[PDB]
Amino acid sequence: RVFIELHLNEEIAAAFVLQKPILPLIYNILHKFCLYQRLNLLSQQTFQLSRESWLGHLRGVYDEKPPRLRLYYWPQLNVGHYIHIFVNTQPISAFERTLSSKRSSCEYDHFLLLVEWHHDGIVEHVPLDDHMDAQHLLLLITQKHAQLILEQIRKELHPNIFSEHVGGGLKIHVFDNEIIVKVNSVTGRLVLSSSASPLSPPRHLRAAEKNIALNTQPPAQILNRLYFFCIQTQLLE
Amino acid sequence: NILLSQIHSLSNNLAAHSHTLQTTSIYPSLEFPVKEQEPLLTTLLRTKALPEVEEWEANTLQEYEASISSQPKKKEANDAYQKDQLWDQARIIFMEERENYSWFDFVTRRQESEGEFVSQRQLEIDRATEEQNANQMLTDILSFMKSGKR
Amino acid sequence: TSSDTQQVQNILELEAKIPDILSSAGKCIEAIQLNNSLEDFRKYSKEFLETVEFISTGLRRQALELEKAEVPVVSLQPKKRYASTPLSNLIFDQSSKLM
Amino acid sequence: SPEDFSVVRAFMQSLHSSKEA
Amino acid sequence: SDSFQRQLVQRTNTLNSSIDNATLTILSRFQDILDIAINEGKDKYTVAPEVYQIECHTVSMVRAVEQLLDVSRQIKSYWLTNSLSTSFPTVDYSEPDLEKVKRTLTKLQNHLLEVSLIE
Amino acid sequence: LKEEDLQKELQKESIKTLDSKRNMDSQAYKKELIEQIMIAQTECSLALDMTSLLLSKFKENSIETISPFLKSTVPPSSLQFSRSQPPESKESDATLAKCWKEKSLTSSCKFLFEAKERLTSVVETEHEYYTELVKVKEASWPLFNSQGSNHLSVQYSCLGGISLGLGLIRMKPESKSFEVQSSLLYSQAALKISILNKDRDEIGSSTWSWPSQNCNSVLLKDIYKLQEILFEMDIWNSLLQEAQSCGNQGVNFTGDEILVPISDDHVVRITLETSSKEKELLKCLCDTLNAIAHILFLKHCRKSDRLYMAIDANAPLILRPLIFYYNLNQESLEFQRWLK
Amino acid sequence: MQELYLLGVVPSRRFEAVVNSLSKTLDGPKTILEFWVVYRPKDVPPNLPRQPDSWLRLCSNIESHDETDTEWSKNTQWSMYLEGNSEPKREDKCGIRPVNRAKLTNGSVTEFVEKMGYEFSHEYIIQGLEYFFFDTTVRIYQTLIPSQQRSIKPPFHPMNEEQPWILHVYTHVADASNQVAMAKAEANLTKVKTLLSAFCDLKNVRL
């Protein structure tokens, strides 16, 4: 604290050499300082996460020059994607500028901290809660992307099978029973559980899940086969 | 330390050529007269002691003045001689005493030399031969397993 | 024959006697300069040499007794998946009290 | 210690930003 | 790489080298103080370097002693680094009472279940 | 400075020899040093220059030795020297020399005395620290020199578990007592297992307590508590990667905790409690779960690394047994409820 | 099947230290007690059989039978090892020895080999411990000659007075041709060797 007192002090003095109002300059310098510190915190959270859990499934990049962090989740491509942390200037509202006057001044250079998760061929700006654990954020995004891919397979399903998207997952209906498809945030892998008997999933679900994980062919093709199999065996019994 | 070695060499040179250096005297002339207008000469050839040195000397002399307050002066010089003698005696007996001991041995004081003896190189030769014969035992047992040599 | 703990104890003794090297050397300079006693210098010098010899030889002794006891130079890298019998004990113990 | 180092990095980067501006 | 024995002897020769070097500087420094202690030639200009030398040599002596302390520490550490413990702290003596754990296991597993005899 | 504090002090002041008698930075010592050697260098450089001028009158050797500034400023062959007669020796001067050397020796011997005293204090503390280390390894805890090469570290995670944790012993000198410092971020760590009803209220829970065997030395107690903490951390992590593999059974890991749905719209909640720095039967059930979860972890530790079609063989197996037997009970209960 | 191996020697006092201390380095000790017998092809056609090396040996686990009673060669499970000579030009690197093995049940192993036309050569016992590292074993053993043929438990005759112990490092690759798998087994062997070398020095030898 005393350190920044002196350094800051030097800074405002030179500003006086050139006579540019202080209250802005100190606001700018010091807010951006806090943003950078939070970003640092997040980075150490993610690297800690890359060691503690997530080990096989998190890769972390901190960058100097304009210090920025990007996190690589689900390093395994799916039959690409990362999330970018970023400091950038929010332009002043034309209406904010008109309102601003004297003590309330828009003339201060001001900016926010924000994130945009990269997706194969797209970019989306994600609101950032001021109280957001880095783990919590990683979860949030992974679930979004989740829902997206799992709805994509649902569409690639067979047309006659009644499927339902809800509960963060997919429900494939088989004779008033359900197969439930989700994705684990960390692994980013497909998880097939059974409606009846949620604690022990039948052998053919387990074997399906293993085959999806092999990434040899689209999930939908497998799940289609598993639907027809599941039908047949239940009747045959 | 290196600085010490340098200044020691210098003091030796100066004392060795001390006679020839205190007979000679230095004055500038002839060719310096082109630059003679400058006080640089006076600063370059000045032999005023440094101010710290000058004071130092003064203080130490005051200390001698306390000492003469203590005792008469005539007695002082002979005592000084006697002491220098003392130091030379201390020097030679230290040389003897040191040459007497043994230094670069393992637990081999005078007293321990009387006691026992310990050899590092003999231990090392011992372990080396033991490992070599043990290796021959290996190669022999290996050829036994492969094709009986018992 | 001595335990490792015994050996480091030995070293602690030598250590405790090391700073007295300065002590003795100074005692000797002081004794001849302050007191002009050539024989005090004889005694205290002699003590100085004896002390340095005992320390020196004692430590070279130690290093030797290291190579004799074949103590590895590099520290070994411990394994990572133990389950140790004492641990197992604490283990079954608390399991039992909880049951 | 290196966290505090990172606090400094945050400041110096803030400063470089304000200087460029 | 070097042998195991090569490693051991390498170490001891190192520790020696360092240690006789330090003792030898203690001896040689004291010796040279002594060589310089006589004030017979007494050229005051020669006496002043001599004073510097004296100060510098005594400090060099203490330096060497401290070096000895570094060596002795290293030796202790080495002794303590050696993996000869071959034991564990083991504070045990709280008894398993297994048969109780069996019975509580079964008891829990058969909650609300009518059981029958083996066959 | 505070207005209240000051009004107190100034209010207290309202209550109230002719000679006036009044009684550092490593950078500062640095400056003093460089200052002194610099003045030495300027003196010696001067002498060098002058001698170089003369000899340069008589040799090539000293055109080299003279400074470029001086040789540019002044023409060579400038100075002269003639035989002369040496000066009378000053009695005060020699008495000075002798006084100097005597003071020099006394200074030296005093310095050796005080250096011996300070090094004896040093060796004393050293002896203290090492007697405690000896006390420690007498209890067969391995120790390794730390990465800083200062002091030594005990391996509290030496009984077992996955992670290897070691921490250095340091002397807290003010209290004259030893303390064990570790990379661990938790003052406290213990596995909490719990049951959640339909309304998500906590019906019961278990957290193991360790046997707390009697130990004589503060240091060894601190060791045990560290070892415990890290072991708990090992268990929580293992449970986590287990939950990665067996999601299809319903184990859900929110970033905060693990939970597992259960047959009567109940949930089990497995958390790790941490500091940063019918009811009787049911608690028997919790404690049973924690205990068996334990034991099973331990089994995972005994295993050696090197069949079925599960996704990860290296995944530990604590949850999955526990839920396996639970599910056998529940299936059987449904069967009997039908038959009844 | 290809096996990559290092080995070393351990004197008797140095044995106990190497053992406890091995327990400190890598995965704990498994007791191993093996009974080995070799056989020799009786036809010895000199041109092509090459019977000096290729002839086979076979062994089996004796965990606990001999201490309890007279050893029963019929009772224990048996397995047969064909281990060839080691590949030369390997002074620098780890050694390579091709080894093939099969497990044998429900038969008279002795009568089978001799009915092949093989015939007794030598009979020795292997006793010691083996430790584990990922996909690479390490056994310290001693070569105890039996008191008698199919010797009982009490005797355990030792070959030499010095009783030196032998250090074997185990690594197995199924497919000879794959260079990637040889590379990873090589590096696993290097890493384990480094650690083990801090412990004690050991290196590649022939066969």
Residue F98's closest chain B neighbor by CA?
B80
Resolution in A: 3.4
Contacts of B34 in chain F (CB under 8 A): 74-75
Method: X-ray
* A209/F324 Cβ within 8 A: no
What whole-number distance in Å separates Cα of residue G97 and Cα of residue G131? 20
Can you spell out the DSSP letters for E42-95? --HHHHHHHHHHHHHHHHHHHHHHHHHHHHHHHHHHHHHHS-------------
Is B121-150 in CATH node 1.20.5.790?
yes
Angle at A72 between CA A70 and CA A78, to 5 degrees: 145
What whole-number distance in Å separates Cα of residue A194 and Cα of residue A202? 7
Contacts of D3 in chain A (CB under 8 A): 40, 44
Token pair of G59, please? Answer: 């062994």
- Under DSSP, the state recorded for G203 is B
Residue A8's closest chain D neighbor by CA?
D15
How far G200 CA sits from the closest chain E CA (Å)? Answer: 6
CB pairs under 8 A between A and F: 46
Measured in degrees and rounded to the nearest 5, phi and psi for residue E43 equal: -70, 110
* E52/B95 Cβ within 8 A: no
Measured in degrees and rounded to the nearest 5, phi and psi for residue F98 equal: -60, -45
How far A91 CA sits from the closest chain D CA (Å)? Answer: 15
Domain coverage including residue C59: 1-99
What whole-number distance in Å separates Cα of residue F194 and Cα of residue F272? 11
Strand spans (E) along chain F: 79-83, 143-145, 152-154, 167-172, 177-181, 188-196, 202-207, 252-253, 258-262, 266-275
Domain coverage including residue G65: 1-207
E7 interfacial to chain C (CB closer than 8 Å): yes
What whole-number distance in Å separates Cα of residue F260 and Cα of residue F268? 5
G201 interfacial to chain E (CB closer than 8 Å): yes
Comparing CA positions, the residue from F326, F314, F163, F313 lying closest to residue F236 is: F163
Gaps in chain F (C to N over 2.5 angstroms) fall after: 16, 23, 277, 306
How far D12 CA sits from the closest chain A CA (Å)? Answer: 9
What whole-number distance in Å separates Cα of residue G129 and Cα of residue G30? 5
**How many independent structural domains does chain E possess?**
1
What whole-number distance in Å separates Cα of residue F65 and Cα of residue F117? 48
Token pair of A29, please? Answer: 């310098």
- Touch between chain G and chain D: 3 or more Cβ pairs under 8 Å: no
Token pair of A147, please? Answer: 């829902």
What whole-number distance in Å separates Cα of residue E58 and Cα of residue E71? 20
Q: Is residue A179 within 8 Å of A194, Cβ to Cβ?
A: yes
CATH of the domain at G12: 2.40.320.10
Token pair of F16, please? Answer: 């109230």
E104 interfacial to chain C (CB closer than 8 Å): yes
Q: Tell me the CA distances in angstroms from F319 to A218, E108, F253, one per residue in order.
A: 31, 17, 12
What whole-number distance in Å separates Cα of residue E85 and Cα of residue E83? 6
In one-letter notation, the amino acid at residue F266 is H
* B130/G166 Cβ within 8 A: no
| Radius of gyration (C-alpha) of chain D in whole angstroms | 9
* D6/A4 Cβ within 8 A: no
Of B94, B101, B106, the CB nearest to C60: B106
Comparing CA positions, the residue from G143, G53, G31, G158 lying closest to residue G98 is: G53
Q: Is residue F191 within 8 Å of F270, Cβ to Cβ?
A: yes
b/e sequence A34-52, b meaning 16+ C-beta within 10 Å: ebbbbbbebbbbbbebbee
Is B25-68 in CATH node 3.20.20.70?
no
Comparing CA positions, the residue from F29, F44, F217, F54 lying closest to residue F136 is: F217
> Taken in order F326, F329, F332, F337, is the CA torsion positive or negative?
negative
F112 interfacial to chain E (CB closer than 8 Å): yes
Q: Is residue D15 within 8 Å of A45, Cβ to Cβ?
A: no
Residue B130's closest chain G neighbor by CA?
G11
**How many independent structural domains does chain C possess?**
1
- CA dihedral angle for residue A51, residue A53, residue A59, residue A62, rounded to 10 degrees: -60
Contacts of G134 in chain F (CB under 8 A): 305
* Pairing between β-strand G57-61 and β-strand F252-253 as defined by DSSP bridges: unpaired
Distant-in-sequence, close-in-space partners of F221: CB < 8 Å, separation ≥ 6: F215
Order the strands of the F177-181 sheet from edge to edge: F143-145, F152-154, F167-172, F177-181
Q: Tell me the CA distances in angstroms from B112 to B103, C8, C53, G84, one per residue in order.
A: 12, 21, 11, 58
Element (H, E) at D13: helix D2-20
* A109/D21 Cβ within 8 A: yes
* E30/C60 Cβ within 8 A: no
What whole-number distance in Å separates Cα of residue A27 and Cα of residue A8? 11
Angle at G100 between CA G94 and CA G103, to 5 degrees: 135
CATH of the domain at C23: 1.10.287.3490
* F291/C18 Cβ within 8 A: no
Distant-in-sequence, close-in-space partners of A164: CB < 8 Å, separation ≥ 6: A170, A171, A173
What whole-number distance in Å separates Cα of residue F93 and Cα of residue F87? 12
- Under DSSP, the state recorded for G87 is P
How far D11 CA sits from the closest chain A CA (Å)? Answer: 5
Measured in degrees and rounded to the nearest 5, phi and psi for residue D5 equal: -50, -45
**How many independent structural domains does chain G possess?**
1
G58 interfacial to chain B (CB closer than 8 Å): no
What whole-number distance in Å separates Cα of residue G203 and Cα of residue F333? 63
- Under DSSP, the state recorded for F248 is G
Q: Is residue F126 within 8 Å of F132, Cβ to Cβ?
A: no
Q: Is residue G148 within 8 Å of G156, Cβ to Cβ?
A: no
* C42/B105 Cβ within 8 A: no
B129 interfacial to chain C (CB closer than 8 Å): no
- Suggest the residue from E21, E76, E100 to mutate for an interface test with chain C (most C CBs closer than 10 A): E76
What whole-number distance in Å separates Cα of residue B61 and Cα of residue G57? 101
What whole-number distance in Å separates Cα of residue E109 and Cα of residue F327? 10
Token pair of B113, please? Answer: 């030399």
Comparing CA positions, the residue from A92, A88, A94, A48 lying closest to residue A71 is: A48
Residue that has been written with the tokens 């372990």 in this structure: B127
Token pair of C39, please? Answer: 């024989």
